[PDB]
Short mmCIF file of C-alpha atoms and ligand atoms in Angstrom, two decimals:
data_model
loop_
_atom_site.label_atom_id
_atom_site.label_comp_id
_atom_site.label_asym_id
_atom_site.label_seq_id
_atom_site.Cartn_x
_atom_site.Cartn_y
_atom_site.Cartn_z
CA UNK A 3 0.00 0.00 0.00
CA UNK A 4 0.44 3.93 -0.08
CA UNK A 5 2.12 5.93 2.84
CA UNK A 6 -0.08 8.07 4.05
CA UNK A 7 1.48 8.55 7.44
CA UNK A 8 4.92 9.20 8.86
CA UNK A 9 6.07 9.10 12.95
CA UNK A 10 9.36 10.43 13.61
CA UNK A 11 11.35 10.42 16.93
CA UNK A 12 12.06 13.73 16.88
CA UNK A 13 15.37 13.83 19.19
CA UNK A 14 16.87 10.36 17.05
CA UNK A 15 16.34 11.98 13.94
CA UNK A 16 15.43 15.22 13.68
CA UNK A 17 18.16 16.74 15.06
CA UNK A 18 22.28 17.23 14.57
CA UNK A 19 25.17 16.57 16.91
CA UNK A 20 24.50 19.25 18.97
CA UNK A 21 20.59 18.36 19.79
CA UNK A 22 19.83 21.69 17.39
CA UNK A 23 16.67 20.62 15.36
CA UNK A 24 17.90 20.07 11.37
CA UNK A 25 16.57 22.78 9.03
CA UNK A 26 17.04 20.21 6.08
CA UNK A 27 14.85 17.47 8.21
CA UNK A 28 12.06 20.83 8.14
CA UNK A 29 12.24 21.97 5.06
CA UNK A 30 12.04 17.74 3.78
CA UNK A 31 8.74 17.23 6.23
CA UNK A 32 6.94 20.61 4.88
CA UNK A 33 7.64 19.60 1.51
CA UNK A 34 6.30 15.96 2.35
CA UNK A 35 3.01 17.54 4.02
CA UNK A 36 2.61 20.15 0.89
CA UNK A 37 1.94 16.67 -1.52
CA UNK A 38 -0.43 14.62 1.27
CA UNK A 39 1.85 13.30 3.91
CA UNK A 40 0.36 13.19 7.29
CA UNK A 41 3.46 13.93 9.96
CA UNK A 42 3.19 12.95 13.46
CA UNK A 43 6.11 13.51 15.66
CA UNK A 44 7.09 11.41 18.97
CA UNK A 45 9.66 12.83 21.62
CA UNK A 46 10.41 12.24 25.14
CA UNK A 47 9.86 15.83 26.45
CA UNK A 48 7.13 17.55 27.22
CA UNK A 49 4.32 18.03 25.71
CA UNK A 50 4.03 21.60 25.32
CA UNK A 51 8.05 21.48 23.79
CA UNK A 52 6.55 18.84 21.28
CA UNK A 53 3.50 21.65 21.04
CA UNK A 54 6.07 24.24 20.14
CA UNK A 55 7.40 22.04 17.26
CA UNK A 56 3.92 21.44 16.05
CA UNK A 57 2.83 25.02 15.79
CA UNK A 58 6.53 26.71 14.50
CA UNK A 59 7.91 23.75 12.50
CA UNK A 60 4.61 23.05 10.73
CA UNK A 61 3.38 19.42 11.62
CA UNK A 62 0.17 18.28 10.39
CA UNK A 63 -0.65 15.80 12.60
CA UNK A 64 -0.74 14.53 16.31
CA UNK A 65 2.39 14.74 18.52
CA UNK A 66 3.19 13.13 21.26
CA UNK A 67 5.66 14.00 24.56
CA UNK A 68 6.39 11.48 27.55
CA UNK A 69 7.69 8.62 25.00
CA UNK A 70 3.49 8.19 23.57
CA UNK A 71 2.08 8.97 27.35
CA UNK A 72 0.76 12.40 26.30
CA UNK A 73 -0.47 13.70 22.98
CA UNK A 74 -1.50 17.36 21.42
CA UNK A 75 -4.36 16.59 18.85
CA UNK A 76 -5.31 18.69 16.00
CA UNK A 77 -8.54 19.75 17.52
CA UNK A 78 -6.26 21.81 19.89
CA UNK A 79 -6.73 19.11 22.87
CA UNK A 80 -4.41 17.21 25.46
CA UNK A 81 -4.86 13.90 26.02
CA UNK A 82 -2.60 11.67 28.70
CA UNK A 83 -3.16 8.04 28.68
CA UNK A 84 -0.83 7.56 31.43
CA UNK A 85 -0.58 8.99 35.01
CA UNK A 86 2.76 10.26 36.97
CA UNK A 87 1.47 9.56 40.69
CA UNK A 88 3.01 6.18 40.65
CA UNK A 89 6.39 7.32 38.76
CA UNK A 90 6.95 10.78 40.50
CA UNK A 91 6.25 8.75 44.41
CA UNK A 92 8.87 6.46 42.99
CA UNK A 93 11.35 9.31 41.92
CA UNK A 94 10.82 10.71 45.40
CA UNK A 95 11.66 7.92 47.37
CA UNK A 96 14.41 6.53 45.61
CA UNK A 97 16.38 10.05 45.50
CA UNK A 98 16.49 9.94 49.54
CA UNK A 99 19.32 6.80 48.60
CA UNK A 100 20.65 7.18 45.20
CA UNK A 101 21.49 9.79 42.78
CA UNK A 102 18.59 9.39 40.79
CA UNK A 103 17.16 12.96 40.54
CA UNK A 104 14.51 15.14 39.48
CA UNK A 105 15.02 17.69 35.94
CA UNK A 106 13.10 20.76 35.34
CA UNK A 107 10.81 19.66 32.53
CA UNK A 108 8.94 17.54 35.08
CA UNK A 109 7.10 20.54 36.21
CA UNK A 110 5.52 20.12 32.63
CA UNK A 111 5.03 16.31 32.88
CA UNK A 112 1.67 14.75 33.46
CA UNK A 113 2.13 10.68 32.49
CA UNK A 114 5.86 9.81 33.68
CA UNK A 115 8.90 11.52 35.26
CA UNK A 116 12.10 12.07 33.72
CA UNK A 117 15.42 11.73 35.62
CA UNK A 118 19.20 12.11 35.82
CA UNK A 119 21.25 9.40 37.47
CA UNK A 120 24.69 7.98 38.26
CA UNK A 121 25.76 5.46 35.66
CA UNK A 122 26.63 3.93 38.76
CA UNK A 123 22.76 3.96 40.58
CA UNK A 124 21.50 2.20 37.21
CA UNK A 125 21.52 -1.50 37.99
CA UNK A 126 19.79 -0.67 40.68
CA UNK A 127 16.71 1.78 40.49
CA UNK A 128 16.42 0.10 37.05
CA UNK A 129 15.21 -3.21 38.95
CA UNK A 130 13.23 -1.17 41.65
CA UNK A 131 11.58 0.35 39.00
CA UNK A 132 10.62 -2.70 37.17
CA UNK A 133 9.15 -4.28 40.37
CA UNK A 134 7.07 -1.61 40.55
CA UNK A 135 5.04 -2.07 36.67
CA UNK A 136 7.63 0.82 34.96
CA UNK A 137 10.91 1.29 32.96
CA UNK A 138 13.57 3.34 32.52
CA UNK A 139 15.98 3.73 29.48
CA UNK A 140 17.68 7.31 27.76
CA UNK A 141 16.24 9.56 25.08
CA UNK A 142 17.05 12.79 24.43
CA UNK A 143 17.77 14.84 27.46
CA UNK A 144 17.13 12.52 29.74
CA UNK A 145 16.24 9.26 31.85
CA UNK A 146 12.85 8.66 31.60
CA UNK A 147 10.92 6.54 34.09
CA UNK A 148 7.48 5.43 32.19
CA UNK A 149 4.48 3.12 33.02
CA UNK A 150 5.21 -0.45 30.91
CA UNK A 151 3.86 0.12 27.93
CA UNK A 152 3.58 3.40 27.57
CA UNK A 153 6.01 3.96 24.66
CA UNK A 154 6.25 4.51 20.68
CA UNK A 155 4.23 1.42 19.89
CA UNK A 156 1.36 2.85 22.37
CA UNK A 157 1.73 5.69 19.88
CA UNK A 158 1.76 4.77 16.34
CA UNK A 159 -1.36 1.88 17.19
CA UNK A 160 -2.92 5.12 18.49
CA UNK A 161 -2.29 6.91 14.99
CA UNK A 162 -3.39 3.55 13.13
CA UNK A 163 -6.64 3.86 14.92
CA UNK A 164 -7.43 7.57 14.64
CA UNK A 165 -6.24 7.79 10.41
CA UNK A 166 -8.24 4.29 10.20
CA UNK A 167 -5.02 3.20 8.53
CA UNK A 168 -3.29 -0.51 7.83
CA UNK A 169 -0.27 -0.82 9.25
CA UNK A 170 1.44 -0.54 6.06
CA UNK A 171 -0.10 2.40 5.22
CA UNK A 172 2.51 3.78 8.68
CA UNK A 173 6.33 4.64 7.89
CA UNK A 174 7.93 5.06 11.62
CA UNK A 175 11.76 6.68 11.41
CA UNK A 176 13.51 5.83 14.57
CA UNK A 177 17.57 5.34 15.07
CA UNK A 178 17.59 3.06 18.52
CA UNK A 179 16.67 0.66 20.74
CA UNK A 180 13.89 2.87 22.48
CA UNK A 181 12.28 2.30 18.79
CA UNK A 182 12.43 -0.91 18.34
CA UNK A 183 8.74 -1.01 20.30
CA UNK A 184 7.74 1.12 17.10
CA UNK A 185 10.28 -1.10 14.37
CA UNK A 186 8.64 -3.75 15.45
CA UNK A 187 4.95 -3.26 14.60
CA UNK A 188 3.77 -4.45 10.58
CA UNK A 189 4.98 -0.97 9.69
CA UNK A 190 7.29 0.74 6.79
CA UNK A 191 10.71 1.56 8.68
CA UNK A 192 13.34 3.86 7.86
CA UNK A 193 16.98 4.90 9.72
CA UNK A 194 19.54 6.64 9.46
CA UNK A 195 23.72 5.89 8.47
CA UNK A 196 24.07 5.72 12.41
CA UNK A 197 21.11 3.93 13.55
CA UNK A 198 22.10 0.66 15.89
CA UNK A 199 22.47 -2.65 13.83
CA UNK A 200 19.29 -4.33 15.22
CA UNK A 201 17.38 -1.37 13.94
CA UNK A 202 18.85 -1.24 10.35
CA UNK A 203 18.22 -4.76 10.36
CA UNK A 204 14.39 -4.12 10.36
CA UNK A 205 14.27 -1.46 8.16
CA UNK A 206 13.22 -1.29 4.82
CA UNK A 207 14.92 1.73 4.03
CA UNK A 208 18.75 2.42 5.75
CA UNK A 209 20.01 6.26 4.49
CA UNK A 210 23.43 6.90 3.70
CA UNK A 211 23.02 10.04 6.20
CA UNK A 212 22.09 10.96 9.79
CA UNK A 213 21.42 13.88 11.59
CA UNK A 214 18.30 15.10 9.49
CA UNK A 215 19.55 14.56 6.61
CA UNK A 216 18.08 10.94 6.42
CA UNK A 217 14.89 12.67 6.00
CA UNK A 218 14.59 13.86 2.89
CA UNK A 219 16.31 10.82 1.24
CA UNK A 220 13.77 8.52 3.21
CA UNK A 221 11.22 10.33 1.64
CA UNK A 222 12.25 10.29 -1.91
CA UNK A 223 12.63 6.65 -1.63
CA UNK A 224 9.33 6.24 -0.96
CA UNK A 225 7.74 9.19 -3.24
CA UNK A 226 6.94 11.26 -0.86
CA UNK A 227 8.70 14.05 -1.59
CA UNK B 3 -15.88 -2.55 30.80
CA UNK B 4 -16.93 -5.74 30.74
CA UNK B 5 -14.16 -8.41 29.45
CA UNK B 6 -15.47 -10.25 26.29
CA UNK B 7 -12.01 -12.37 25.04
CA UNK B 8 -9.48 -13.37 27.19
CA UNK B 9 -6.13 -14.29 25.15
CA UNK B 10 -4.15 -17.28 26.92
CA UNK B 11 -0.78 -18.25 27.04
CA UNK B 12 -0.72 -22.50 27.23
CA UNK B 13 2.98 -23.16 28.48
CA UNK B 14 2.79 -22.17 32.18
CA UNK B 15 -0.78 -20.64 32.67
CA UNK B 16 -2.94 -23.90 31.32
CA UNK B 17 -0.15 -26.86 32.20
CA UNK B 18 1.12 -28.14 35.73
CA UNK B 19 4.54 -28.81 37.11
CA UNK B 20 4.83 -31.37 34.78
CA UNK B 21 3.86 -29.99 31.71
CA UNK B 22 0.42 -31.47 31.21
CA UNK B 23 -2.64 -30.09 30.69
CA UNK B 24 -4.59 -28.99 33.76
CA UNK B 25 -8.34 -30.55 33.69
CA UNK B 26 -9.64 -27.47 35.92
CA UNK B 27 -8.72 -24.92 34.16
CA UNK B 28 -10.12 -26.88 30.84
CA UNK B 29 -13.45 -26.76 32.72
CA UNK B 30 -12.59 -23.32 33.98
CA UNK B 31 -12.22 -22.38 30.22
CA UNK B 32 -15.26 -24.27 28.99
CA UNK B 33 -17.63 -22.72 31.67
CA UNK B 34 -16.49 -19.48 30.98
CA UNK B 35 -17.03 -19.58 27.51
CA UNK B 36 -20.70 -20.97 27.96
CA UNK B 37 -21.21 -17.82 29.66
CA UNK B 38 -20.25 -16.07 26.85
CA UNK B 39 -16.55 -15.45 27.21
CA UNK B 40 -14.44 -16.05 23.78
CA UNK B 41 -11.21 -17.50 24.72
CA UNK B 42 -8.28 -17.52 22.14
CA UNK B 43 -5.10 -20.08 23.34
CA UNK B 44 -1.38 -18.87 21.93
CA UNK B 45 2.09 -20.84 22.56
CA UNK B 46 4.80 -21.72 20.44
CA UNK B 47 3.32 -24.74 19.24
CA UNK B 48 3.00 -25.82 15.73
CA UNK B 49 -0.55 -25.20 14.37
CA UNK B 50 -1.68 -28.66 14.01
CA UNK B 51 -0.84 -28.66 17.82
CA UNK B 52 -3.31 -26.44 19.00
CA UNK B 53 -5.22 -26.94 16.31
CA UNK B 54 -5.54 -30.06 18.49
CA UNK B 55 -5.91 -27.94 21.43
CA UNK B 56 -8.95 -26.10 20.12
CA UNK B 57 -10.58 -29.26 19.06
CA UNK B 58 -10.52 -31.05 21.83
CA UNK B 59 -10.02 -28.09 24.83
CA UNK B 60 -13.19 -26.87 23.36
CA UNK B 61 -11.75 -23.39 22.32
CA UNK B 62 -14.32 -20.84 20.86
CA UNK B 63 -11.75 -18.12 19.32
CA UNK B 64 -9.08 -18.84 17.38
CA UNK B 65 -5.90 -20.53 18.21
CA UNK B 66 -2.09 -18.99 17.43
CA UNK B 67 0.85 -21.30 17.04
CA UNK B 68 4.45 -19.74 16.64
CA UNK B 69 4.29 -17.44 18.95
CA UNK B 70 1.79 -15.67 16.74
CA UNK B 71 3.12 -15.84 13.28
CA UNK B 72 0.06 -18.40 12.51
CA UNK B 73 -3.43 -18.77 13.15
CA UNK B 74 -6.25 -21.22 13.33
CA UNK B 75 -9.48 -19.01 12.74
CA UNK B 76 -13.10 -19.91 13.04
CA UNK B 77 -13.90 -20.57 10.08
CA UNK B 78 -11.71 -23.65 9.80
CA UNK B 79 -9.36 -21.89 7.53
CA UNK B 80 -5.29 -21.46 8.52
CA UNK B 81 -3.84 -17.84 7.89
CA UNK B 82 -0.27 -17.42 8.26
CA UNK B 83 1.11 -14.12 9.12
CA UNK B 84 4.82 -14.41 8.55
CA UNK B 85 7.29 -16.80 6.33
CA UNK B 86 9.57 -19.39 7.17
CA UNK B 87 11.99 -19.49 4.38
CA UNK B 88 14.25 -17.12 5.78
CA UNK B 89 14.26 -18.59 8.77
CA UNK B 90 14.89 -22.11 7.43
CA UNK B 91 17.25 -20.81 5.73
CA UNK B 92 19.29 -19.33 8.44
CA UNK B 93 19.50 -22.84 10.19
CA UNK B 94 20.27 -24.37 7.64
CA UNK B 95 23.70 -22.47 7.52
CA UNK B 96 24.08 -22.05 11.12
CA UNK B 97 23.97 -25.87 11.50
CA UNK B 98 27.03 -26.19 9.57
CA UNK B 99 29.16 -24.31 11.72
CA UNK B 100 27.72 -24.73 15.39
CA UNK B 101 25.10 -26.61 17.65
CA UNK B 102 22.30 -25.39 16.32
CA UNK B 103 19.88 -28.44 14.66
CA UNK B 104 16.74 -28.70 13.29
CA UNK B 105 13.70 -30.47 15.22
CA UNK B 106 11.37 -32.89 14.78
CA UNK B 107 8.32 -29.97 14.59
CA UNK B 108 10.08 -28.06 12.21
CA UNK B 109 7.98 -30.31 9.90
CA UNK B 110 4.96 -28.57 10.81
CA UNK B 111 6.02 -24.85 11.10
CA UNK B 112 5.40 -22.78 8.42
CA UNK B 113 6.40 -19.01 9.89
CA UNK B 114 8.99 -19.35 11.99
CA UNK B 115 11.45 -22.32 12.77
CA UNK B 116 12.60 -24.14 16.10
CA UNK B 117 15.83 -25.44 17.15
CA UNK B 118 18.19 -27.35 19.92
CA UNK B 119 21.53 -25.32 20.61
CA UNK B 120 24.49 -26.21 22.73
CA UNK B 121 24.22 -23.05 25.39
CA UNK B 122 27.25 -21.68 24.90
CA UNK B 123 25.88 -21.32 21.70
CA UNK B 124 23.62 -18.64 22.19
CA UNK B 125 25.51 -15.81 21.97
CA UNK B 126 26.81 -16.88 18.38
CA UNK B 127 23.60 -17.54 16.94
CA UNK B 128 21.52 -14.79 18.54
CA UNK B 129 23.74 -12.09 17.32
CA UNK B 130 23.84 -13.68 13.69
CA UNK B 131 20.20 -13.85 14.13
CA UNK B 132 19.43 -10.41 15.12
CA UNK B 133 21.70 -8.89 12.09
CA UNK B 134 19.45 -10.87 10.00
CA UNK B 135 16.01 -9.16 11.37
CA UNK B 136 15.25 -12.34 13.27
CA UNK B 137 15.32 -12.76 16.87
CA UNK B 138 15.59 -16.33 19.38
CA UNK B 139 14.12 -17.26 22.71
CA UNK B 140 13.73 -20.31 24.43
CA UNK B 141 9.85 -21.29 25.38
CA UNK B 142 7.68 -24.79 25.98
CA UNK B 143 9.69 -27.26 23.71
CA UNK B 144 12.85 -25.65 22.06
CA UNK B 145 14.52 -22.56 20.91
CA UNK B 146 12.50 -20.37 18.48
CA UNK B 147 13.83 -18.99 15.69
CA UNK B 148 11.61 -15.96 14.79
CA UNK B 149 10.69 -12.85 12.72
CA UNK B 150 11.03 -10.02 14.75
CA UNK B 151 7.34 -8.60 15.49
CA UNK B 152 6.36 -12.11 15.33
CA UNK B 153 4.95 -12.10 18.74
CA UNK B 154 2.20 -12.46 21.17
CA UNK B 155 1.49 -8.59 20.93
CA UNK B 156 0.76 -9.03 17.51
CA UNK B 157 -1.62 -11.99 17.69
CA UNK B 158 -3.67 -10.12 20.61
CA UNK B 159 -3.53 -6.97 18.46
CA UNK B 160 -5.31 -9.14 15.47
CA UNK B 161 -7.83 -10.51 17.49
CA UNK B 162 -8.81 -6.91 19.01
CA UNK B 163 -9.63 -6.05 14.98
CA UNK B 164 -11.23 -9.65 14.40
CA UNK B 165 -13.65 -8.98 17.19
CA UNK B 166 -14.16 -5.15 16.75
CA UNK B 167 -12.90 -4.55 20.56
CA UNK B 168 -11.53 -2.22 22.80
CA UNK B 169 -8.32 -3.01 24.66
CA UNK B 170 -10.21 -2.96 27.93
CA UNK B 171 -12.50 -5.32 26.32
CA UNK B 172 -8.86 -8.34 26.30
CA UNK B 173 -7.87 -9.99 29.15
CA UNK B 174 -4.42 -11.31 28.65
CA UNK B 175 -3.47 -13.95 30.73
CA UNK B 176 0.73 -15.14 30.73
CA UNK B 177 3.65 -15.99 32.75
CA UNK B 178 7.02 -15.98 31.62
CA UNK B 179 9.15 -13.42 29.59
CA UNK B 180 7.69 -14.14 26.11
CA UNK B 181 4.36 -13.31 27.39
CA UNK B 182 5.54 -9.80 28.42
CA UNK B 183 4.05 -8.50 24.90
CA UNK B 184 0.80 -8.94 25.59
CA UNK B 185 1.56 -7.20 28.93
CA UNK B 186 2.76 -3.86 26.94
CA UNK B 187 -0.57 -3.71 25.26
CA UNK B 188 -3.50 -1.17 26.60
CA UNK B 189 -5.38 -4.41 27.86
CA UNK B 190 -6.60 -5.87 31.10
CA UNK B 191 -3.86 -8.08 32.71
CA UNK B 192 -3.59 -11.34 35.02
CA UNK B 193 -1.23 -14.04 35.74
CA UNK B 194 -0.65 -17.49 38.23
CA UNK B 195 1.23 -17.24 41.86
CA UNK B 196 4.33 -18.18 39.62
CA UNK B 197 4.69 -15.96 37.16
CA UNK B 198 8.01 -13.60 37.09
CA UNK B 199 8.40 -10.86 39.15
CA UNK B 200 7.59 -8.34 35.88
CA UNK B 201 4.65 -9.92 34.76
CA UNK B 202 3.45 -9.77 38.40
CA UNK B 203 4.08 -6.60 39.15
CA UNK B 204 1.99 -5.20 35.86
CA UNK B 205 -0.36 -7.43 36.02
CA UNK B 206 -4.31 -6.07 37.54
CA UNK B 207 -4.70 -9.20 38.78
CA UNK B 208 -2.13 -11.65 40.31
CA UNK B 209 -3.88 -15.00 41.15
CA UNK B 210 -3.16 -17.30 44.62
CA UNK B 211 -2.86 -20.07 42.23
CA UNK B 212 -0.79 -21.42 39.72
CA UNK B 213 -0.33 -24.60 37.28
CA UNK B 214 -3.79 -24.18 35.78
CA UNK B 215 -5.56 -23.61 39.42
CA UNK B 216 -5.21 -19.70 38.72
CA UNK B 217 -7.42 -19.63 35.39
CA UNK B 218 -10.84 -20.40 37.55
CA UNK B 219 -10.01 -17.74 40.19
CA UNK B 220 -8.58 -14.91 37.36
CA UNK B 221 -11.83 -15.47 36.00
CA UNK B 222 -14.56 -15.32 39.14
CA UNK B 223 -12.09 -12.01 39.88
CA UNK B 224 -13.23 -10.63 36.48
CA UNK B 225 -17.13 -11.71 36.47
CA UNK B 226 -16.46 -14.23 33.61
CA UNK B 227 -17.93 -17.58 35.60
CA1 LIG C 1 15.45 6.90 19.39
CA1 LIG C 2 20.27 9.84 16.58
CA1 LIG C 3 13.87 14.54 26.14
CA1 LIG C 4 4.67 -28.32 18.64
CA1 LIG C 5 4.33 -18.82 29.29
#
């Protein structure tokens, strides 16, 4: 089938070595969206920093902050499908004996609580947390401590089911291991030159670039652009 | 709401200490389904194997085998989602270099491919295997060679769009680490005494029982019997 829909992880892809967002990556979605491409973008910050991308880089469709856990519609709406009482009372009590810590975007998060932590403290909270029904793994600026299941996959099913779209009808771009929840849905996948092995093993598509730039060849590939 | 298919793992949630089938939670199953439940059994059985299950368990939704790559639908038919030549394939050279063999229900598979392997093994094979797009676990009989996606996640997600249902509409019940995908999914959850630590701790419901014994009380807990 046709690819009607795109969902990029906007810090593994849409940015360059120095975290700055990619004016090529831009320039390659809004030319996408000008011939029919729905974009939807999928970050682990907050939702009204994924909000600000919507509205200033131009995306047409839904975006999501909190790893999938939070999304801005395009009816103007907020919608969490997750809660942080469970991850922020963890946060709390485990930073009275480790060095696991709370980050200013939290005061913006409403479905899961970032964090910044000793490489030494991982081993650790990272089994206290998974007792508990959560997770923790890197992406972007920070730890992120999220409910199980709450992650890209969460995401693009919920796309699927509000475009009424067939899975191959989905192209996800991710460049990691916190995509593979996405890479391995019955989707189209695309990475970039430096995306892990197990994830250019998946893909359909592997660019000869990275750091935005994988963008618009992905999307010529595929006629999209 | 109210639960209307309940998606069961066989190895470890319908079998006893010795691996056989337990006759209460068969009856469990069957009265349940009288009262309008629709149960659907997955494992990593071949698909004449609980095809046999279905039969003669008395199982009113359809059955996976192969961890989900194939399915036994209502309508008599087989559908198979995924494709074992590649699989096959990768054995077949594998087997001339290390421990890895071929089994005796490798006859039957059709989506995926099982195998024996010296442990120290593993390592070897599983990083061939994941360069390759495949991935390997051990479960029930054997090894399982397998498509990555290929999972339990994926069978639950295609029953959800068989029956027209809601997530909260699925109760998953599983035990071990290859159940986990069904765990990530929006659904309800529940699991025997035994099962890991994970799956207990996201579960909504974690039974008394195990070895078959939990499926009756998982079920009164959920107004199914
Ligand atoms: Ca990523
Ligand atoms: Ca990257
Ligand atoms: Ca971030
Ligand atoms: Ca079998
Ligand atoms: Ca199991």
């Amino acid at each position: 089938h046709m690819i009607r829909l795109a969902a990029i992880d906007v810090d593994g892809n849409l940015t360059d070595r120095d975290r700055l967002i990619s004016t090529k990556a831009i320039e390659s979605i809004r030319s996408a969206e000008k011939k029919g491409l729905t974009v939807s973008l999928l970050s682990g910050n907050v939702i009204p920093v994924v909000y600000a991308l919507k509205i200033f880089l131009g995306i047409n469709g839904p975006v999501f902050g909190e790893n999938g856990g939070i999304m801005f519609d395009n009816d103007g709406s907020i919608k969490k499908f997750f809660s942080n009482e469970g991850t922020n009372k963890f946060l709390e009590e485990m930073s009275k004996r480790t060095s696991m810590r709370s980050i200013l975007t939290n005061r913006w998060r409403e479905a899961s609580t970032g964090f910044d932590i000793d490489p030494e403290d991982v081993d650790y909270v990272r089994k206290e947390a998974e007792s508990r029904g959560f997770v923790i793994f890197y992406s972007g600026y920070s730890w992120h401590l999220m409910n199980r299941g709450e992650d890209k996959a969460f995401a693009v099913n919920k796309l699927k089911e509000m475009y009424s779209l067939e899975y191959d009808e989905i192209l996800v771009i991710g460049d990691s291991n916190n995509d593979m929840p996405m890479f391995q849905l019955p989707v189209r996948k695309a990475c970039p030159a430096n995306a892990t092995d197990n994830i250019k093993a998946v893909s359909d598509f592997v660019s000869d670039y990275s750091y935005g730039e994988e963008i618009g060849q992905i999307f010529k590939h595929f006629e999209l652009m």
